């Protein structure tokens, strides 16, 4: 029982489809650019090279690269699962160990201050630490079931300095010198060399042939298993930690036989945002998770060395995707290890899934947004160079839209580059031929081998790696593109083009960009042909083909 | 958006998802069920074009041979773009036909156009903050400072908003699409080329069906001269490889109703196994397991 009103309509315009052929033959009768551009190349490794140049130009030079490992640590032997009394039997021993190093750095001194505040503990606030907080009951010094206080009067002069400070313009690494490069990818082939490195109904019958069998026992003795796991435990204490009473007291954790220590600050609770928790981690220097250069400070012992790392602020959502890195990497590796069965038809070697497993934990470790957007673009440049005409240029400026921090950004670049270089090389040839389509037998362009990223084996399509850059993508958690700079950019570019539709609109008239522009004074103008602004005849015919 | 907003964007969606789902069998290729038939149905008649031969008349009753070639453009068309006016589908709507006998709610689509052409952005306030937070730049920080007259909203014209206006700009493009198609057939009357396309959610494959020399031989290029000394001006750019000037012509009838093919995101190919065997795995899947 409703009836619709009248409104308004509009006027059908006459037009006519002779006037816009007489526009195109008007229009054919000249020089035509292609908007896409070849791939030789050559042509991509110049425009990487200008590009180089272009940002070591707009952007300062950095001669010390930042931090890229939220979580600094190191595993020789290996791990078992954190327990209350393994915690105690560690943190017992790693204070005996603490207390036998001389401070050079004030927070070495901090480090010091809590080890010795730990290691005088009474014995009821010691075992009042480690109780279940239904039996847990207050004391002078320890309130909280896993927390301690830490008043100014133990604090030294070094620690009070640090309290104090941390309670109280881009640049970028020069890309277009060899040395910096060289030793960034130095530096990370170390990193994954260390991680690599091994540590002394019918389809579960399936999966104990293949899966079990050339990917879990695989990864099982590689450092990055232990070091995953190591890491799990880390965050579980962290996100223990992050409670509204417990965060404003001080903690004290230590892992793996005391070797690994986890130390944490008073931090802001996370049940509001923008609140950051800080911690510090001593630990023994072997092969692993390490990187000297970001470490704070490196303390001498007997035959021995003892690294410190620097106040670690984290979020609460990268601490929930380091608490699951392991379980990604391993979900990320299975998705690769499935992909090259579909690909090769066989199975990989165990080489190459320790190198996956390696480069996918890393990823996992790390997460940046440098790093998301550098992938979001490698999923979509593959296509342009594997492709004959492409705009691949403007991917690669897309590439270098942001700053370089860290190495790991350095080493991706790298082997970004060479990957594309390869991959347009590969073009060169390109043989016609006469195979089935669908139905019929008909010509292919067909270029023969596509180089992977992770590891050394080649693929026979490159859907295989769109799959594996993908996965790598999606490694990255889903919110991190909420950052700051995303939401600039987005109102940013809406504002520019609403202020280019007002400098268009007051240019040219309210009415005519309103209503469209006819198309006689589209070919007395010739520039009405842009975006944001359309001809009433071309819809009019438009509108009549699709009638027709 | 505003619920207001979301009223007209449901009107305008709705009327053309229904005006469009009925041509999903050839030109619009809607996801889950029948998605690869309109672009299967598209690369059959391109291969079955490929397959023939083209034999071009001349003046003294001549024939000379040509190699029917086909090459492939895969292009975002259809993705929302900031750059857009969303005026022109009023006159879009204004006499497409339908089987309704009165006129009565094409109408209030062409309101609910009307009334979402205008718009107001809003700021957010953790962008305030930041801005509030030592600005110094001058360009982009001046101009956003200025869009906003209060501080805290300004104006906006031509796009929605990446609203739901995805199965309109479908069809929007189709239109266009075809009518690039029926212009390049009048302009060239013995120039008998191929052109085929479908669209997929927001992307749309381009067949275009080019020609070139089989014995290289100076045939093609004394029709061409002939041609344009006897008056037709347009065959400049059709001597040499003009596929150019197919993707050309079609870019241009495309930016004529404000639709742009980004130089970004963008490649075109000849023939290949894998290139048409990934584009049929994009239409098929969308979302990857991992």
Same mark, same amino acid.
């Given at each position: ?14 037009a ?26 050559? @042509? ?7 590009? *180089? ?5 707009? $952007? ?8 890229? &490992? ?7 032997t290996? $791990?078992?699962?954190?327990?209350? =009394? ?46 279940p ?16 206080? &830490? ?14 400070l ?46 079990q ?35 404003? $007291?001080?903690? =004290? ?16 609770? =996370? ?8 911690? #510090? ?38 601490? &929930? ?5 392991? /379980? ?5 590796t @299975? ?26 934990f ?33 991917? #690669?400026?897309?590439?270098? *839209?942001?700053?370089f921090?860290?190495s ?20 060169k ?20 081998? $596509? ?10 399509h490159?859907?295989? &790696? ?31 083009? @609403?202020?280019?539709?007002?400098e268009? /609109? /007051?240019?040219?008239?309210?009415? =005519?960009? *309103?209503?469209?522009?006819?198309m ?29 | 958006?505003?619920l207001?907003? !979301? ?18 069998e050839?030109?619009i290729?809607?996801?889950?069920e ?33 190699? !029917? ?21 009023? !006159? ?16 209030c689509?062409? %309101? ?6 205008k718009? %107001? ?28 007259? %209060? ?14 206006l995805?199965? +309109? ?8 699409s ?14 008998? +080329? ?8 927001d ?11 089989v ?10 001269s ?65």
């Amino acid at each position: 029982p409703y009836y619709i009103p009248d409104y308004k309509g509009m006027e059908p315009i006459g037009a006519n489809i002779e006037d816009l052929v007489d526009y195109s033959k008007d229009w054919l009768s000249r020089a035509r650019n292609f908007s896409f551009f070849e791939v030789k190349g050559t @042509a991509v490794f110049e425009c990487f090279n200008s590009n *180089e140049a272009n940002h070591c130009q707009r $952007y300062p030079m950095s001669r010390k690269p930042r931090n890229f &490992l939220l979580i600094q640590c190191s595993l020789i032997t290996s $791990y078992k699962p954190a327990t209350t =009394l393994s915690d105690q039997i560690d943190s017992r021993r790693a204070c005996s160990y603490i207390l036998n190093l001389i401070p050079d750095t004030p927070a070495s001194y901090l480090i010091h201050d809590m080890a010795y505040r730990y290691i005088n503990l009474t014995r009821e606030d010691m075992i009042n630490y480690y109780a279940p907080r239904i039996q847990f009951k207050q004391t002078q010094n320890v309130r909280e079931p896993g927390t301690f206080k &830490l008043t100014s009067s133990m604090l030294r002069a070094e620690s009070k300095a640090m309290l104090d400070l941390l309670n109280n313009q881009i640049e970028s690494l020069n890309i277009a010198s060899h040395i910096v490069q060289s030793e960034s990818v130095s530096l990370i082939t170390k990193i994954l060399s260390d991680l690599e490195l091994n540590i002394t109904t019918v389809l579960d019958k399936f999966f104990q042939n293949e899966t079990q069998k050339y990917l879990i026992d695989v990864l099982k003795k590689t450092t990055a298993w232990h070091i995953g796991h190591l890491i799990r435990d880390i965050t579980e204490s962290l996100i223990a930690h992050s409670g509204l009473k417990r965060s404003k $007291y001080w903690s =004290l954790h230590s892992y793996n036989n005391g070797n690994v220590i986890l130390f944490i600050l008073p931090s802001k609770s =996370l049940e509001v945002a923008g609140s950051f928790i800080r911690f #510090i981690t001593v630990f023994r220097i072997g092969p692993g998770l390490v990187d000297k250069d970001n470490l704070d400070t490196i303390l001498i012992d007997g035959d021995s060395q003892w690294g410190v790392s620097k106040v670690m602020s984290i979020d609460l959502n990268r601490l &929930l995707a380091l608490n699951i890195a392991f /379980e990604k990497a391993l979900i990320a590796t @299975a998705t690769w290890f499935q992909y090259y069965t579909e690909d090769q038809g066989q199975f990989p070697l165990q080489y190459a899934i320790r190198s996956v497993f390696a480069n996918h934990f890393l990823l996992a470790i790390c997460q940046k947004m440098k790093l998301c957007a550098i992938f979001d673009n490698l999923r979509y440049l593959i296509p342009a160079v594997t492709s004959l005409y492409s705009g691949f240029p403007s991917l #690669i400026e897309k590439l270098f *839209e942001r700053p370089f921090k860290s190495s790991l950004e350095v080493y991706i670049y790298y082997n970004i580059k060479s990957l594309l270089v390869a991959l347009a090389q590969n073009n060169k040839a390109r043989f016609y031929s006469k195979v089935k389509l669908l139905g019929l037998t008909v010509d292919q362009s067909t270029v023969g081998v $596509y180089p992977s990223f992770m590891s050394r084996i080649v693929y026979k399509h490159y859907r295989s &790696l769109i799959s594996e850059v993908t996965t790598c993508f999606f490694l990255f958690e889903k919110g991190l593109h909420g950052n700051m700079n995303e939401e600039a950019k987005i109102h940013l570019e809406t504002v520019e083009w @609403a202020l280019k539709f007002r400098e268009k /609109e /007051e240019k040219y008239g309210e009415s =005519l960009v *309103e209503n469209g522009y006819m198309m006689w004074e589209l070919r007395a103008n010739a520039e009405l042909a842009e975006q944001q602004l359309y001809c009433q005849d071309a819809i009019e015919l438009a509108a009549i083909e699709l009638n027709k | 958006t505003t619920l207001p907003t !979301r009223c007209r964007l449901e009107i305008i969606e709705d009327y053309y998802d229904a005006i469009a789902k009925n041509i999903s069998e050839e030109y619009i290729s809607y996801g889950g069920e029948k998605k690869i038939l309109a672009i299967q149905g598209a690369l059959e008649k391109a291969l079955r074009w490929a397959s023939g031969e083209s034999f071009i008349e001349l003046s003294n009753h001549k024939f000379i041979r040509m190699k !029917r070639k086909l090459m492939y453009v895969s292009a975002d068309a259809t993705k929302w773009s900031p750059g857009d006016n969303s005026a022109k589908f009023r !006159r879009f709507t204004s006499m497409l036909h339908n089987g309704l006998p009165n006129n009565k709610l094409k109408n209030c689509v062409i %309101d609910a156009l009307k009334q979402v052409y205008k718009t %107001d952005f809003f700021m957010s306030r953790k962008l305030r903050n930041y801005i509030d937070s030592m600005e110094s730049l001058d360009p982009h920080i001046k101009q956003f400072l200025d869009f906003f007259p %209060d501080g805290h909203h300004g104006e906006v014209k031509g796009n929605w908003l990446q609203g739901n206006l995805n199965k +309109c700009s479908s069809l929007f493009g189709v239109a266009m699409s075809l009518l690039f198609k029926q212009v390049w057939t009048n302009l060239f009357p013995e120039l008998d +080329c191929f052109f085929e396309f479908a669209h997929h959610s927001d992307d749309a494959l381009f067949i275009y069906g080019y020609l070139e020399p089989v014995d290289d031989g100076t045939d093609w290029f004394l029709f061409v001269s002939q041609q344009i000394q006897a008056g037709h001006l347009h065959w400049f750019s059709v001597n040499t490889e003009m596929w150019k000037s197919m993707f050309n012509l079609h870019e241009h009838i495309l930016l004529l109703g404000s639709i742009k093919i980004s130089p970004k995101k963008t490649t075109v190919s000849p023939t290949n196994a894998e290139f048409l065997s990934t584009f049929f795995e994009g239409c098929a899947v969308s979302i990857p397991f991992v």
